[PDB]
Amino acid sequence: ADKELKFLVVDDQSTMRRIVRNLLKELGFNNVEEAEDGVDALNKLQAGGYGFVISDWKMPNMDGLELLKTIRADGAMSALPVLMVTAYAKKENIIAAAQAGASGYVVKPFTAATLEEKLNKIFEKLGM
Numbered sequence: 001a002d003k004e005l006k007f008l009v010v011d012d013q014s015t016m017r018r019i020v021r022n023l024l025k026e027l028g029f030n031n032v033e034e035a036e037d038g039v040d041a042l043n044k045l046q047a048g049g050y051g052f053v054i055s056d057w058k059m060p061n062m063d064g065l066e067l068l069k070t071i072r073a074d075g076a077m078s079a080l081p082v083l084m085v086t087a088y089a090k091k092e093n094i095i096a097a098a099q100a101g102a103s104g105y106v107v108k109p110f111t112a113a114t115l116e117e118k119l120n121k122i123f124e125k126l127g128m
C-alpha cells in the first residue's frame with residue numbers, strides 16, 4: 001500500500017495506541033493520528049484525509065461497534081477500511097462486527113506478525 005496512507009488509531013488506552021502506531025511505523029507508515037474514543041475519532045475523520053481506521057471496541061463516549069456502524073452508514077466514508085483490534089474474543093462479538101462491515105478483526109493480545117498479516121489481508125481485498 002501507499003506509505004502516505006493516513007491512519008487513525010482509536011483506543012481508549014494510550015498503551016495500545018502506542019503499540020499500534022509503533023507497529024505502523026515499522027511497516028513504513030508514518031502518517032498516523034490517534035483518537036481516544038469514537039466521538040474523538042469521528043471529529044478527526046470529519047477533518048479529512050484519512051484512508052484507514054484501526055479501532056478498539058470497548059471505549060467510553062462512543063464504542064467501536066457504534067463507530068464502525070456510523071462510518072459504514074455515512075456517504076462520505078462508507079467504504080473506509082476499519083480493522084477492529086479488541087480484547088472481545090467471543091464469536092458473537094466477531095459476528096456483530098463482521099456483519100456491521102468490519103474490514104478485519106484482531107483479538108488482543110496480538111503479535112506484530114498478526115497485525116501485519118491482517119492489514120495486508122485488507123489491502124489485498126481492496127486492491128490497495
Ligand code: BEF
Pocket residue numbers: 056057058059085086087088108
Ligand atoms: F477495549 Be478494546 F475492545 F480492547
Ligand SMILES: [Mn+2]
Pocket residue numbers: 011012013056057058059
Ligand atoms: Mn478499550
